[PDB]
Amino acid sequence: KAELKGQVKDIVEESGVDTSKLTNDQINELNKINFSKEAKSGTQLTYNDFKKIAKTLIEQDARYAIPFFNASKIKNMPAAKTLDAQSGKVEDLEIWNSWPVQDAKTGYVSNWNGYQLVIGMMGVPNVNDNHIYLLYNKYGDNDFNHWKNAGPIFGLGTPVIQQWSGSATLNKDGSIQLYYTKVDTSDNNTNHQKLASATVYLNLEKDQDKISIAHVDNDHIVFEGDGYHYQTYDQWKETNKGADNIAMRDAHVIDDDNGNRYLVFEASTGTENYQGDDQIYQWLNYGGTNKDNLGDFFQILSNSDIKDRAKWSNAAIGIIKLNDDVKNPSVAKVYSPLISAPMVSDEIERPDVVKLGNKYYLFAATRLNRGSNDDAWMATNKAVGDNVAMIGYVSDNLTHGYVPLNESGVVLTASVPANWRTATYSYYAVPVEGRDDQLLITSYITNRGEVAGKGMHATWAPSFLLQINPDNTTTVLAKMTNQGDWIWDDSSENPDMMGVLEKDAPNSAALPGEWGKPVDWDLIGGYNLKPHQ
Ligand SMILES: OC[C@H]1O[C@@](CO)(O[C@H]2O[C@H](CO)[C@@H](O)[C@H](O)[C@H]2O)[C@@H](O)[C@@H]1O
Ligand SMILES: OC[C@H]1O[C@@](CO)(O[C@H]2O[C@H](CO)[C@@H](O)[C@H](O)[C@H]2O)[C@@H](O)[C@@H]1O
Ligand SMILES: [Ca+2]
Ligand SMILES: [Ca+2]
Numbered sequence: 001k002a003e004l005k006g007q008v009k010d011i012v013e014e015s016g017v018d019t020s021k022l023t024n025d026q027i028n029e030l031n032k033i034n035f036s037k038e039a040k041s042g043t044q045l046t047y048n049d050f051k052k053i054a055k056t057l058i059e060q061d062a063r064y065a066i067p068f069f070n071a072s073k074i075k076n077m078p079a080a081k082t083l084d085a086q087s088g089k090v091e092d093l094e095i096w097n098s099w100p101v102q103d104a105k106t107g108y109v110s111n112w113n114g115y116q117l118v119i120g121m122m123g124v125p126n127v128n129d130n131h132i133y134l135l136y137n138k139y140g141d142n143d144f145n146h147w148k149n150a151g152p153i154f155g156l157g158t159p160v161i162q163q164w165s166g167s168a169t170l171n172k173d174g175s176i177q178l179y180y181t182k183v184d185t186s187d188n189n190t191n192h193q194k195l196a197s198a199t200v201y202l203n204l205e206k207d208q209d210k211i212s213i214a215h216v217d218n219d220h221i222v223f224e225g226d227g228y229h230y231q232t233y234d235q236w237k238e239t240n241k242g243a244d245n246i247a248m249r250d251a252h253v254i255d256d257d258n259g260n261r262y263l264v265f266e267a268s269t270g271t272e273n274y275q276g277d278d279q280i281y282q283w284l285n286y287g288g289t290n291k292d293n294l295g296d297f298f299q300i301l302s303n304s305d306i307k308d309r310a311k312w313s314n315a316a317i318g319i320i321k322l323n324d325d326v327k328n329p330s331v332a333k334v335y336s337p338l339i340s341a342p343m344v345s346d347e348i349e350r351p352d353v354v355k356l357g358n359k360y361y362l363f364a365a366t367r368l369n370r371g372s373n374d375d376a377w378m379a380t381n382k383a384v385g386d387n388v389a390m391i392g393y394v395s396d397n398l399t400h401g402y403v404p405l406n407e408s409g410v411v412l413t414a415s416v417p418a419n420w421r422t423a424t425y426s427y428y429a430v431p432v433e434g435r436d437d438q439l440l441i442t443s444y445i446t447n448r449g450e451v452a453g454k455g456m457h458a459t460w461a462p463s464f465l466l467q468i469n470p471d472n473t474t475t476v477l478a479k480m481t482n483q484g485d486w487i488w489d490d491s492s493e494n495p496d497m498m499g500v501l502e503k504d505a506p507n508s509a510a511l512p513g514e515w516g517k518p519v520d521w522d523l524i525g526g527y528n529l530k531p532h533q
Pocket of ligand 3: 244245268275312313314315346
């Protein structure tokens with residue numbers, strides 16, 4: 001019986017929608033929309049941003065598309081033939097999320113007694129086997145085969161206690177301060193994640209060029225969520241009706257110029273801007289033109305799966321200040337999210353803050369299929385056979401005021417199907433010494449679990465340069481390295497690592513047998529692919 005009331009009235013008219021042709025229920029829903037302009041949880045990844053990101057992906061623009069790799073050159077990591085944490089025996093592990101021991105202000109890969117040090121998740125494919133390992137090479141060395149493994153940081157283990165991604169920097173005494181995610185799986189196989197820290201001490205034998213783990217001290221939980229800014233495990237236990245992501249992970253250490261230390265990490269928003277049926281009616285979340293936003297509003301309302309995901313999406317990239325106890329830190333201060341995606345996504349991962357000149361750049365990896373807009377992400381699988389991207393923001397301040405790069409946030413987009421050898425994920429930008437406008441993008445290549453075939457293991461990708469423009473835009477550069485190079489310099493470039501999207505080229509991006517092979521059931525993988533321009 002009733003009618004449109006408040007600001008929504010103006011909105012419907014602007015749109016050119018015939019008010020009389022609105023059913024009774026429509027008007028009741030429309031009257032639920034809330035037009036508050038006050039942002040509750042930092043800069044947002046909006047429904048519109050998401051859609052644009054997906055569109056940019058489908059377009060395969062050379063500005064943002066992950067360069068093609070020469071598939072025939074990709075090999076499993078030799079240092080991955082190593083003692084496994086959950087069996088104590090030498091096995092063929094694969095290696096994924098990885099991070100260099102790096103300086104906390106500058107991000108530069110650290111030089112430890114002439115070695116570069118990287119810490120990474122490794123384990124046996126198709127086994128629940130998530131643990132972190134220390135890897136090392138001479139500093140500046142580019143040979144993938146020269147990396148060696150110093151073993152699991154915490155020794156032999158089980159799936160009850162796992163270690164997922166974080167970061168690492170050096171202490172003054174040359175120990176490593178490690179930030180990692182401790183995960184406890186005892187409560188009904190849930191991944192109960194906590195941000196943790198430990199001091200790792202190394203034994204070096206100069207004459208054998210061999211590093212070992214000597215002591216691991218001060219292992220403790222640093223942060224579990226506050227409940228207001230960030231969701232806690234308890235809050236998740238209550239609400240989670242099965243269809244909910246839990247996140248307290250991927251801590252990236254950064255220092256300001258005054259020597260304060262912060263961890264930037266992946267989480268979910270707490271009660272400050274919580275998930276729920278209400279998030280659908282927050283006009284703020286749409287971020288398009290009013291007309292656009294109204295189309296979106298209806299899409300969500302009529303598609304029950306989208307509506308469902310929308311209720312549950314509240315990914316956030318959080319930040320906390322640590323106290324001054326370097327080796328045994330506690331939380332000094334909890335801030336509001338740098339970025340959040342209420343209604344839009346339940347997963348933004350591996351955040352990374354690099355300070356370039358005077359601005360703070362924040363990047364994160366995402367899988368668009370964790371997004372709420374099925375029509376958006378199903379279309380990317382149809383185009384490219386993958387839905388991964390790296391998003392990015394810039395700010396004058398570490399702790400607030402982030403602004404999306406390239407309009408929507410997109411910085412990098414998936415360019416080959418997820419079950420190809422050359423599929424990539426877990427982008428991690430590393431700064432380049434004496435090039436303050438470029439970043440080295442590292443990642444891992446080949447998805448876990450042998451999706452690309454037996455013996456095809458997740459391994460370190462060739463790295464490639466990304467160009468940062470002061471006008472808040474980015475361009476992918478056609479400059480590529482050997483597999484597993486964390487340190488760009490002039491000797492680093494290896495153009496033979498570059499691929500082409502052609503079936504029979506010797507530097508094809510597809511291995512023999514991949515071009516046109518199925519992904520996600522029927523989708524002929526490679527059909528909708530096009531050259532980068
Ligand atoms: O139980 C979580 C744990 O299982 C593993 C190995 O069994 O997952 C593998 O199998 C999944 C499908 O059943 C894949 O989606 C997954 O990517 C693959 O690794 C572990 O990898 C995972 O940590
Ligand atoms: O292996 C855990 C590690 O990988 C990331 C992504 O690089 O998360 C992966 O594992 C989670 C559960 O196994 C998934 O929820 C997520 O989608 C998957 O990509 C990191 O965030 C995490 O530290
Ligand atoms: Ca959620
Ligand atoms: Ca190098």
